[model samples]
Target: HAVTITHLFGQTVIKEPPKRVVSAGYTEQDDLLAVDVVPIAVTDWFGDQPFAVWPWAAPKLGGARPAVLNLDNGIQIDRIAALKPDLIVAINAGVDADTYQQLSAIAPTVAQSGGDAFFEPWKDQARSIGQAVFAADRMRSLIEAVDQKFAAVAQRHPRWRGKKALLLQGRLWQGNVVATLAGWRTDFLNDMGLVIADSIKPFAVDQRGVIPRDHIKAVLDAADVLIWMTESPEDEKALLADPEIAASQATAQRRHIFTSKEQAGAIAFSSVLSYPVVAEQLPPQISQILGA
Candidate 1:
């Protein structure tokens, strides 16, 4: 009685559709909703928004309310056991192989795998989830919606392109900044119409596929436009005020430093949430930051 998920990782075979479905995090919840399905229970995304985590959380959403599982430590699996779910879908991927095996004994589990590796391309993540849920058309619709949203943004700001930028992430050490050239495929960037700075494309670093803190200087110094993200104000200020960084071509030109929710919503790196949260809220958030 295996269910075939031909849409993801080629073809994955699951046993059933999980009657009392429960999601481990927001990404799974969003994807489930994207497919016009509903979860029986869900956990918050690091407690960011207790009332509403998804973009349009209050809109009936094609189903009943999902119980939110809140906990200071790991999930209360004992509590979840009471919910009587036939199958469990844990996308955290850190639950470990042994844990996945253990959970499977509870109720046919698909508790994390290499699904965490799909951050670069949303399609990869969607396909992986599709394999688990047998949802192919929903993934396609979500992608189309994403493309349309971006197209609208592109239309409004046709002249938004000026500086040739590179997405600088993680710590860049040893003169090697891990750019999107290392972080993701070129086709994805091209779809967004990004201007990759050539300096980052030929970086010397390998393995991490991300910039080390030491390599930040070289990465910052060489670009005209830099799509940078920081978790703290200290990191933010250091990058903004560095004399060498200010002298960089992108820094001098003052490029688009848009805010993206790196750890929230379905698409890990700027998905559907990026529109209202990043592009729209960015100007106001930046204004508040600068007290403008």
Candidate 2:
């Protein structure tokens, strides 16, 4: 049986459930693996990570390990073609028209959603992948299970309700700008019972989610909590040292929560597997800080 999936670039018809698949999307692999379909090859976005898979997703691979494809520069069309997969999944991926065209030449290619390209919400991502793989029933169960976990966590931690937090990425290269985290990144946070800070809404642009340096103070002050997604300890340290950012009482009073590379990736992906773990790990720290 085949499935037709519509996206920004139009529609792709998977001729059948793909036995040999490849994941070009940075996070789609998680959804595929969650439904028990592992990609024959996975993209190397992080370059140095083990198996081109993150910790939250790695265990789902079982004993199956996929070949690695490098996309540090751009789509490696030649490499993807060499794999000869029946399907190439790129949902929640940053695929331009040219790349999508090239990928279609190799196999049935599914591009990102029309409205939200790079960061499509996880529920849609799972359902899209689910339909393609002929496993909608299982994906639905997985999504529902994950949702229940979030609801349970919210019930356990009543203090999170009515709190506004601005989840942000680290400083920019210019060192004068820090971006607010939006889309599914903030969406996942909100699911856990917090509100997204309104200060960055007018300024939110692109996936990098930047807000100007001048607005940092106002946003920080207005926010009840700050969520810092850091590349490393050095990244967190650098942000803390910024006098304008440091001077805010929110920062001074330890209302900010920091995320490691893996933790950030977990939240960014927000797949069935990752969301539960994030909800589990966060409450203790969040409770400790908030004194609940």
Candidate 3:
């Protein structure tokens, strides 16, 4: 079918329904999968190929999975060129404006809609991508299902309300981290009825995002549960264990931590299963970390 989809930036593009599509993951993979377009080939995209990805996306990708291309190193454009894909969508954090031009030569390509604001909700990102691809109705249905699943998770566990949590990413770029408040954490935490410390809410950070390792004390100071974003679980563990600075953090003092990289990845990825974890799995995960 031929259709037009309006996006957040208010750009409306007309695209015919796709026959064969391919993507380098990140929000691109998450959004496309959600719309049920199952690209014939997906790169080994999500940073590290962990067994557990964002839960909602896990099942959407058919099997246990096959390794294709590494999203981190660079795209294997020749392979994609060979695929002669009708469409190629990439919502990569690492790609620059030049990257967009470079990939366009391979196919009728569109860079991710979320763009620099790539860390937003998977639902929003997916919807934007779908709309751009003539899959507006599909985007609507998938989003409703995501919301419905969240409701089920919340209803299944009511007492999960009143929990305090801190969402954090580890040291990057000169040993500093990026912290987020209004992304998937916003959606998943909403389901759990979890509250950010008052300090975190008034954080005066940018809504599109902020590099907040500078004001981390405001975010982490009053949190009861610490959720560290893990790039690599083993590496993060080793870093946290060896650092006297890590031992000094409040999370270490309160003894409440959810450091499982597998679990944390789902949290950061904001897939549907991630919501279940917050409503169902996180309390237990935190309790175990706290030795409860």
lDDT, each prediction? 0.51, 0.78, 0.57
TM-score of each: 0.66, 0.92, 0.70
* Global Cα lDDT for candidate 1: 0.51
Best by TM-score: 2
The C-alpha stretches of model 3 lying farther than 4 A from their native spots are: 5-15, 46-67, 71-76, 93-97, 114-117, 132-135, 152-162, 170-178, 198-219, 231-255, 272-280, 286-292
| Alpha-carbon shift of residue 4 in model 2 (angstroms) | 1.8
lDDT of 1 by residue, 1-292 (tens): 5675432123334776556776654456666655655777777654254433454443435547677775357665776677776656665434555555555556656544454522325455555556566677666776677666545554554443433446554233343444666344333333344455666544444423354555555665555445554544555565666555555555655652533443223123343333334434433332332223
Clashes of each: 12, 1, 2
User: Per-residue lDDT for 1-292 in model 3, tens only?
Assistant: 5454433233333357677776655546666766666676665534455332345566876674533556556677777778777776665434455655656677666555554534555666666566656777877876676577666755655665676665665543344434556555566656555665555555445642233455644455566666666656575664465333354456467533535655665665665334444445565665553333
Clashes of 3: 2
What's the true lDDT of residue 241 in model 3? 58
* Ranked by lDDT, top first: 2, 3, 1
* Top-lDDT structure, candidate number: 2
> Candidate 1 vs candidate 2: which has greater TM-score?
2
| Candidate 2 weakest lDDT stretch, 10 residues | 170-179
